[PDB]
């Protein structure tokens, strides 16, 4: 029947004080016949009331999607407070409860290393720059790329991989035109993680 997802906020949103992090409670496969969904929210078992209620939207088989988004406070999430969405619908035997919070455990800061293009990489029209990150906990992290205070969006980052010591690692590849690299422009991978000083660090690389 009706199925519930509770998504945590984007790591960038929780680590940047200028952004507003939010938990999202998504209910799918809500029948046309019993479409009303009632959301209850709880922060550490204590009910709160500021949640926003989006209007329903058509889905496949005479079903609706209904969503409810709750703004969280950076420090609440970071302090490990537990967020609960309670979903009630007439077609439900009992209400459905989902629980999300930041992983518990000693925060470990990421170690970042950069890899310039190989000799072969330099023969192509487009070169790739790589950023290796390890040693971090929890797995919540944001990796983005910039050059000259402008975003560089042509990158791909792997999901964090669990390490045998309990921490996490990943890599990120940015592809840029070779002419831009040849010109001498500096490129940076920016890493945001809870355990970094001010949640932010940056490694750079340019043509030698």
């Amino acid at each position: 029947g009706p199925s519930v997802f509770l998504f945590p906020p984007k790591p960038k949103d929780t680590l940047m004080i200028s952004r507003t992090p939010e938990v999202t409670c998504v209910v799918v496969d809500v029948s046309h016949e019993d479409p009303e969904v009632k959301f209850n929210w709880y922060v550490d078992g204590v009910e709160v009331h500021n949640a926003k209620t989006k209007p329903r939207e058509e889905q496949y088989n005479s079903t609706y999607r209904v969503v409810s988004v709750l703004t969280v406070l950076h420090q609440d999430w970071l302090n490990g407070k537990e967020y609960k969405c309670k979903v009630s619908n007439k077609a439900l035997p009992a209400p459905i409860e989902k629980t999300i919070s930041k992983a518990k455990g000693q925060p470990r800061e990421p170690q970042v290393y950069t890899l310039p293009p190989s000799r072969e990489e330099m023969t192509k029209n487009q070169v790739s720059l790589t950023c290796l990150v390890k040693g971090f906990y929890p797995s919540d992290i944001a990796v983005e790329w910039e050059s000259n205070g402008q975003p560089e969006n042509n990158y791909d980052t792997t999901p964090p991989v669990l390490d045998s010591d309990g921490s996490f690692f990943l890599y990120s590849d940015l592809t840029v035109d070779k002419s831009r690299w040849q010109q001498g422009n500096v490129f940076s991978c920016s890493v945001m993680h809870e355990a970094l000083h001010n949640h932010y660090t940056q490694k750079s690389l340019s043509l030698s």
């Binding site: 680590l15 940047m16 004080i17 200028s18 983005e144 910039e146 205070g149 402008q150 975003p151 920016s190 945001m192 000083h197 001010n198 949640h199 932010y200």
Partner: peptide, 13 residues
């Protein structure tokens, strides 16, 4: 001191 990402405020200490 404060960290900034692409002209946007990250965090202060």
């Amino acid at each position: 001191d404060c960290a900034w990402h692409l002209g946007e405020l990250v965090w202060c200490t």
